[PDB]
Every structure is written in structure tokens, then in C-alpha cells.
Amino acid sequence: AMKKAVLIVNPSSGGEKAKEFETLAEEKLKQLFDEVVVKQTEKGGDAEQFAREAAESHFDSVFVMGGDGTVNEGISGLAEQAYRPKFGFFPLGTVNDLARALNLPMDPEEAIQQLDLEKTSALDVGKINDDYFMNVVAIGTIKLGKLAYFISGAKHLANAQTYPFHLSLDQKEQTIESSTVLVGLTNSIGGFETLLPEAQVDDGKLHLVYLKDQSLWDAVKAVPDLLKGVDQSTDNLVYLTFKEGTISLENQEELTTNVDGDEGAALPITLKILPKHLTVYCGEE
Amino acid sequence: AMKKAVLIVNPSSGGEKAKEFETLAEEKLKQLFDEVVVKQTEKGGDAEQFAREAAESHFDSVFVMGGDGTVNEGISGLAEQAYRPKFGFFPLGTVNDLARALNLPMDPEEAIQQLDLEKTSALDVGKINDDYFMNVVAIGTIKLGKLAYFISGAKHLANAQTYPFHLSLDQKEQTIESSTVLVGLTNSIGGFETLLPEAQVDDGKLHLVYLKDQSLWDAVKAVPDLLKGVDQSTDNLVYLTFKEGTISLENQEELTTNVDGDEGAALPITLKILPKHLTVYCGEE
Ligand SMILES: Nc1ncnc2c1ncn2[C@@H]1O[C@H](COP(=O)(O)O)[C@@H](O)[C@H]1O
Ligand SMILES: Nc1ncnc2c1ncn2[C@@H]1O[C@H](COP(=O)(O)O)[C@@H](O)[C@H]1O
């Protein structure tokens, strides 16, 4: 009947004129929708709750104005609902990986301006145990000028323990020893747009990378591979894709994942792709 | 006649109980010296001025309580003075490269406790044009967890322009193309104690390292070399020692150096070793 949209705003996202961006977005949506409900997040979980309530109320569309944290929550609130509103977002964050993957303008005002209800794309969603992810599941990752970044960073690989991971992926079984495992959905992770160049938002796959490091010396050698973009296995890392899989430890230890930048489920974890799960408003590319 | 010492204190160095460290140092020095003058720095240059005035007054010893900035200034105030007081210091800084090189205790209280006027070492001092350095002259250097350090750092090599440097070292001439040149006095630079493992505080040499990078890809490949400690030239970097030399640009551009963590002289620069220039109180190693 009446086309309705909710606009979920994280006021802590963005900078000084973020409030002005909210006004632009609201007046733009009011041109497109008969009714626009504006909801402001106050704490963790709010965006997820708002998005879910919008789905239960059969709203036409759900829009998020915030960073990746708020976008994840919003998508989490929609995921596997019997009816799912179309999803849109206006990036206010410092990174905005999903925006990059969908070729949205980095500039919020431009993103609002170029919103086209006709311009959509299917969007895979990740599932990890009982939760959802939209960008990445990371395992085991947490005077000299430009050189200091290595002496701090290339070192901090040493601080990274190796684990006996077992990977059960699409009914293929293997045990590895590694300090670092990443599972991504799109080409962009942490603002590095070329990390997974072959990954597409609707290719229906999870993309896994792990380092073949045992020493601090093999981990360091993987760094140029990551910079070039991971599209194949090398001497220093392995690249795999899968639809469904379980990652566990062969010597069970309390190991917690990092999911879209936040502490997530502990191992073991079962990861699944939800292919073409959402309809998202995208760029004109 | 009467043994006199000055204690130069940077109150902005160190943390909460730094004031208490000053008291311990003062009462320790009063056991060792008939007179102790305590001077507190307020701005850049003060430590250098205090140290120089102590030399002109023929004080027996000069002590610095602070970080590398204050130690550099103190040493700069003594350098090439006709009479030079013996030099000591109590590390309060976050890095303290010189302390590491002399095997002083990291802990200030322990450093004060173990001060032995009989335990000394000769100390080379560096000269760059009209100024002095004690650690390093650097040229051209200024969600994913531990991986982000590279994606930030391994990238930031790209932001590093290459320059056509000319090196005139001990009457040997060569032109190189590089983004990064480092000239050090000791084994420790920026808190990385194994960077120049063969350098000794009194070996009478300046130690030069430059990256053989033209691309972002050769610079990255130099990183494991640096981590292992530079004791030889490799496919990715060159290691040289010299006593006197001039570094210039073949296409003159405004390029400023970084000297012991602070902006220093612009190219061209003439670097010289002042071998065994100071007597410094050292560790029991
Ligand atoms: N009103 C608010 N004030 C402060 N922080 C908030 C607010 N609403 C959400 N957050 C937090 O902001 C983070 C998400 O921000 P972002 O990653 O920019 O979307 C989460 O940790 C939320 O708990
Ligand atoms: N009283 C003071 N208050 C604030 N900063 C100071 C003071 N005295 C010296 N400094 C600065 O502290 C720096 C040196 O600190 P450090 O590297 O810890 O020895 C230099 O930039 C000085 O200008």
C-alpha cells in the first residue's frame, strides 16, 4: 500500500555536520516515500532492533546512516526474516567497506543525492553460528618515520600465536597451523579495497585467506602477497572459497573471533553464505 | 678542586612519579658530589644551554633526566667544548635508545641506584653540518588487527618519494635512487635494539643504511632485512660505514632531515664522527 521507510541514524557516526546530513537524507527520503520514520541509535543493539521492527512492520525500505557497526546491526536485524525490506545506507564512518564494494560515493551528501530506488543489487549476507556478518570474520588477529609501522607491525606478527585450526569446508577437511585466518564477503576489508579482488557482493561465496606462517619470518613474507591483492594461494598464504564450513581448534583453547570489527563468537564456528539475501540500493556503476 | 655536578631535569619527561625520581637522583648525586645544581628545562634549547654553561664553568659532571630529546640537547651543549664534563643520564623517556646502547637499566630507580662514577665508557658523537646527533639522521622517512599495521605501513612506503641522492663518503662517490636513508651511531634506533647489531657506541664510525627501492614493491621486500638486523648489504638494502661524508641531491629539492626525532638541517649535509668524544657513565655489562 503506502511506501514506508525507516531511517536509522547513529549520531556518534561522522563529524560536525553529520546532523545536517541527517536532514538532507530525511528530506530526500520524503520525496521518495509517503512516510519516513527517523530512529536514532543510543547504544549497541538499537540499530538491529529498529531494522527488525521495520521488517516485522513490513516497511518497504530500511536506511542506515552510520559506520560499519551500524550497517552490520541493521543488516543483522533483517537477516533471515520472512519478509525483508530493501536496504540502503549513507556512509558516515571512517572506513565504510560495504560502500566501497557497492561503488557508492564516499561523500555522504553525494550518496544521498544519487540515491535511486531503481538502482539495486542483490547482496550476499554472512552467517556465523547464530549471528551475521557483512564484511569479515577475523581469527587470531588481535624518529624512523614510515619505517616504524613495520618495526611495530612486522614485529606484532611475533606476538601472534599460531593455532592448530581444523577447516571443514564444503565437505573438504584439512588441518592447518596458522596465526591468522580471515573470512570475507566482499573485495574490501578494513578499507583496503583490493584485498580480495575476485570477491563480489553477490558471487555467493565466502572467501578465506590464511597465513602459512609458523615463524615470525613466514608471516612477514606474506605481506607483499596481501598488498597485491589475494586471488590465489602462494608460498606464504592460502586462498579458498566455500559456501558452508566449520572452523575449530584441534587443541581446544579459548579463541574468540572478531566480526566486522567487534568481538564475536568463540570457536568452534560454523560459517554459511546467505546468497543474494538482501536487495540493496547501489551505485550507478 | 670541589667536585660539582649539574642535574638537568625535563619535568615533561616520564609519568606520575617522575618528580620522585628527581628527588632520588638528587640525593644520590649529593652522596657523590660536593655540590649539585638542579636545573629544570622549560622549553627547547634549555638543556643544551644548561649543559654548555656547565662546561664553561668546568663542572665535573653533567647529568640529564629525560628522554632522547633532552639527552641530545645535553650532549649538544657539551660537544666540541674545550673542556667537557663527564656525562650521565637517567632515562625517563618512552624509548631511550642511548640507554639501551650503554646497557643501562630501563627502570629509572635502578639506573640511579647503580650509578658508579668508576664505570665509564668513551662515547662517539655525531656531527651534522653545525649541529650534533646521538642516535640517527633519517632522510626521506616522513578490524584486521595486527595486519592493519602493514596495510597502513607497507602502503605508506608508496607515499615515500624516491630521491636521486649523491653520497660522497670517505672520498668514495656514488649516486643512488632511494626513498629512505638512515645514518646511525649505535645499535639501537627508535627502540629497535637490533637494527644495527654491529654498531658500537665507540667504534668510531657512522653507520649508513639505504633502501634499494624504486617501486613500492622493492621497499616492502627490505622489511625482513631490517627486522633481522642490518649487518650487510642485500638485494633490498645497502649497509655502509664511514667517518666523514656529504649527502646531497642530484636534482636539488627542498629535503629536510630528521635528527634524533626532530626536524633538522636541509640537504646538503656533511656528516662527521667525533670518535670517543665524551666520557659517559655506563652499565656494569
Ligand atoms: N548515541 C550513541 N552514542 C554513542 N555511541 C553510539 C550511539 N549509538 C551507537 N553507538 C555506538 O557506535 C558504534 C557503531 O558506530 P559505527 O561503527 O560508526 O556505526 C557501536 O559501538 C555503538 O554501540
Ligand atoms: N617544562 C617543559 N614542559 C613541556 N615540554 C618541555 C619542557 N621542557 C622541555 N620540553 C620539551 O620536551 C621535549 C623533549 O622531551 P624528551 O624527548 O622526553 O626529552 C622537547 O620538545 C622540549 O621542548
Q: Is B13 annotated for ligand binding?
A: yes
Of B152, B275, B271, the closest CA to residue A226 belongs to B152
DSSP codes of every residue in A148-193: HHHHHHHHHTTTS--EEEEEEETTEEEEEEES-EEEESSS-BTTBT
Give strand pairing partners of A90: A65
What pairing do the DSSP bridges indicate for beta strands A131-133 and A262-266? unpaired
Read off φ and ψ for residue A170, nearest 5 degrees. 45, 45
How many Å lie between the centroid of ligand 2 and the Cα of residue B95?
Answer: 14
Burial of B19 (C-beta count, 10 Å sphere; 0-12/13-18/19+): exposed
Closest Cα in chain B, distance from residue A55 (Å): 29
Helix A68-78 / helix A46-56 crossing angle, nearest 10 deg:
30
In CATH, which superfamily holds the domain spanning A1-123+277-285?
Probable inorganic polyphosphate/atp-NAD kinase; domain 1 (3.40.50.10330)
Can you say how many angstroms the Cα of residue B269 is from the centroid of all Cα atoms in its chain?
A: 17
Cell of A167: 577447516
Rg (CA), chain B: 20
d(CA A115, CA A117): 7
CB contacts of B191 in chain A (<8 Å) are 151
Q: Which residues of A touch B150 (CB under 8 A)?
A: 149-150, 153-154, 223, 226-227
* 3-state SS, residue A32: helix
Q: Give the pairing of strands A206-211 and A181-184.
A: antiparallel
Atom of ligand 2 nearest to the CA of B262: 21
| C-beta atoms of B221 and A224 within 8 A | yes
A216: distance to nearest CA of chain B, Å?
10
- DSSP for residue A116: -
Residue B54, H or E segment: helix B46-56
CA A113–ligand 2 middle distance (angstroms): 49
What residues line ligand 2, using a CB cutoff of 6 Å?
A: B 10-13, 41-44, 66-70, 93
Look at the block and give the residue holding cell 639501537. B188
Alpha carbon distance A66, B46 (integer Å): 49
**Secondary structure of residue B43 in the 3-state scheme:** coil
Chain B residues with CB-CB distance to A258 below 8 A? 143, 145
Reported as type and span, the H/E element at residue A126 is strand A120-128
**Span(s) in chain A for CATH 2.60.200.40:** 124-276
CB contacts under 8 A, B 169-208 vs A, are 180, 182, 189-192
Q: Tell me whether residue A203 is one of the annotated catalytic residues.
A: no
Q: Which of A141, A192, A220 sits opposite B227 (nearest CB)?
A: A220
B150, A146: Cβ pair inside 8 Å? no
Listed by number, the residues of chain B in 207-266 with a beta carbon closer than 8 Å to a beta carbon of chain A are 216-217, 220-221, 223-224, 226-227, 258, 260-261
Atom of ligand 1 nearest to the CA of A41: 8
Q: CA A254 to CA A35: how far, in whole Å?
A: 48
Range(s) of chain B covered by CATH 3.40.50.10330: 1-123+277-285
Residue A82, C-beta contacts closer than 8 angstroms, at least 6 positions apart: none
- Is residue A149 within 8 A of residue B156, CB to CB? The reply is yes
Interface of A with B in 116-145 (CB under 8 A): 135-136, 138, 141-145
Query: CA of B229: which chain A residue's CA is closest?
Result: A151
Pair A242, A206: CB distance under 8 Å: yes
Q: Pick one of 3.20.20.370, 2.60.200.40, 3.40.50.970, 2.102.10.10 as the CATH number of A124-276.
A: 2.60.200.40
- How many Å lie between the centroid of ligand 2 and the Cα of residue B41? 7
- Whether residue B92 contacts residue B13, with contact meaning beta carbons closer than 8 Å, is answered with yes
Resolution in A: 2.0
Q: How was this structure determined?
A: X-ray
